[PDB]
Design a protein around this ligand. Structure first.
Ligand SMILES: *[C@@H]1O[C@H](CO)[C@@H](O[C@@H]2O[C@H](CO)[C@@H](O[C@@H]3O[C@H](CO[C@H]4O[C@H](CO)[C@@H](O)[C@H](O)[C@@H]4O)[C@@H](O)[C@H](O[C@H]4O[C@H](CO)[C@@H](O)[C@H](O)[C@@H]4O)[C@@H]3O)[C@H](O)[C@H]2NC(C)=O)[C@H](O)[C@H]1NC(C)=O
Ligand code: DN5
Ligand code: BOG
Ligand code: BOG
Ligand code: BOG
Ligand code: BOG
Ligand code: BOG
Ligand code: PLM
Length: 326
């Protein structure tokens, strides 16, 4: 008796006192104080104010600088669009619902907001995976006579969309479901109830293997092989000071990317491992949603790592922000 069930929702609060209401109809101030809903709104405001310009500017400078329109950069533009899906599908809606204290758009808006917020985070995840694969292919050259071109980069972008739909679409047609989560102001996959009608258990396993384990394996493999190949080549050219500088910075960047991924990936593993053990207690609205709470900031720090630290993008944005000069 941890929460209150209803059609299309699970409020993580007991109704033994009779105060629980539908998250589609009335504010959830028994889950959190009104000022804590305000702080949730302030958090959404921070993410919008930093997340929209950085990701929009990534698209804008690509229009004003011909050198950026390389196939190896297509996936980075795909990343910037995905973050805009998170910013407008998720953060903007949540800022609005937050200030009402419940999901005022009803179960239909729940499926829309949940689909587009999940699709945005999914496209971003697989863009990082596809980028790791493309870089591994270009550097480690695992195919004897192969050249990465425009058509290959388009496949890579299309691949992220297929994988993203493979996660975000089934809950709209009866495999798992979208419900309000956490403080009930935004919607997502149901990892909270074993809704046997939609076979929630098998979707969690599918999400865990395909959309959680596999991305980590691919990112670690591709980048490990890449760092190995680069350190191998530099070892054969130690007379070149620039070759050694290039090896050092490639390694430093791979570490940063992998640390950035782990910072977003481990909290889910931690929370899930804590839920696998200790399979006895009730989980507050915050607990199973702490990883998602902090994973939202990836809409800001991913473009900072993959674009603002890209030597080309940086100079083009400086020139664009400086009205043409510098
Ligand atoms: C968490 O738990 C609470 C408490 O159990 C639930 O809230 C109750 O929900 C029921 C509906 O299922 C409410 O019952 C309905 O109340 C209507 C209004 O009643 C108020 O007004 C009348 C005068 O009009 C007062 O006399 C009364 O004291 C109330 O203040 C009634 O119009 C409804 O009557 C109709 O349905 C019943 C059958 O349920 C028939 O017997 C009637 O003839 C009529 O057809 C009905 O009684 C109840 O008022 C709610 N209580 C509170 C405190 O809100 C939540 O739904 C639950 N949360 C979740 C998410 O499930
Ligand atoms: C992009 C998101 C749609 C997706 C997401 O929301 N997930 C949360 C639920 C999920 C799958 C992943 O996590 C689990 C952990 C343990 C057991 C089952 C699990 O199911 C996600 C989020 C962040 C990262 Cl880092 C990754 Cl790789 C993937
Ligand atoms: C993000 C900021 C972290 C620290 C904030 C701690 C604020 C606690 O502040 C207290 O919270 C109570 C909650 O109902 C209020 O009723 C009290 O009036 C208030 O003093
Ligand atoms: C850009 C942000 C705009 C957000 C507008 C939020 C409007 C909140 O609307 C308020 O919701 C309450 C229920 O929670 C009602 O009781 C109030 O009457 C209503 O004014
Ligand atoms: C390094 C990984 C970059 C992509 C991380 C995207 C974070 C997605 O976060 C997900 O968003 C959904 C909709 O808001 C929520 O329903 C999920 O609970 C949450 O895990
Ligand atoms: C997922 C892939 C992560 C790759 C991280 C590789 C980090 C290697 O880092 C390197 O390891 C060498 C070991 O001799 C050290 O001598 C170097 O100082 C160090 O730069
Ligand atoms: C700094 C400590 C923060 C603890 C995490 C608070 C978790 C509250 O739960 C939150 O509810 C929101 C509205 O439904 C969702 O948008 C968030 O994804 C979810 O984390
Ligand atoms: C060239 O590269 C620089 C051109 C001149 C730009 C100077 C203005 C930058 C100010 C950005 C910071 C605004 C902070 C807003 C606070 C919310």
């Amino acid at each position: 008796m941890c929460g209150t069930e209803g059609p299309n929702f699970y409020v993580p609060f007991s109704n033994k006192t009779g105060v629980v209401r539908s998250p589609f109809e009335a504010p959830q101030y028994y889950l959190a104080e009104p000022w804590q809903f305000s702080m949730l709104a302030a958090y959404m405001f921070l993410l919008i104010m930093l997340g929209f310009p950085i990701n929009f500017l990534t698209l804008y400078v690509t229009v004003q600088h011909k050198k950026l329109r390389t196939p190896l950069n297509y996936i980075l533009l795909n990343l910037a669009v995905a973050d805009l899906f998170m910013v407008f599908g998720g953060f903007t809606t949540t800022l609005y619902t937050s200030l009402h204290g419940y999901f005022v758009f009803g179960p239909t808006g729940c499926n829309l907001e949940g689909f587009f917020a999940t699709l945005g985070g999914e496209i971003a995840l697989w863009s990082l995976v596809v980028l790791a694969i493309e870089r591994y292919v270009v550097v480690c050259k695992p195919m004897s006579n192969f050249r990465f071109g425009e058509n290959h980069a388009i496949m890579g972008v299309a691949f992220t969309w297929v994988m993203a739909l493979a996660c975000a679409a089934p809950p709209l047609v009866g495999w798992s479901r979208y419900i309000p989560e956490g403080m009930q102001c935004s919607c997502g996959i149901d990892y909270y109830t074993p809704h046997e009608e939609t076979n929630n258990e098998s979707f969690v396993i599918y999400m865990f293997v395909v959309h959680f384990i596999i991305p980590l394996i691919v990112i670690f493999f591709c980048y490990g092989q890449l760092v190995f190949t680069v350190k191998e080549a530099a070892a054969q050219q130690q007379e070149s000071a620039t070759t050694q500088k290039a090896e050092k910075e490639v390694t430093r960047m791979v570490i940063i990317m992998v640390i950035a991924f782990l910072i977003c990936w481990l909290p889910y593993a931690g929370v899930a491992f804590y839920i696998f053990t200790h399979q006895g207690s009730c989980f507050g609205p915050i607990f199973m949603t702490i990883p998602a709470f902090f994973a939202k900031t990836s809409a800001v720090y991913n473009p900072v790592i993959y674009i603002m630290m890209n030597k080309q993008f940086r100079n083009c944005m400086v020139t664009t922000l400086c009205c043409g000069k510098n």
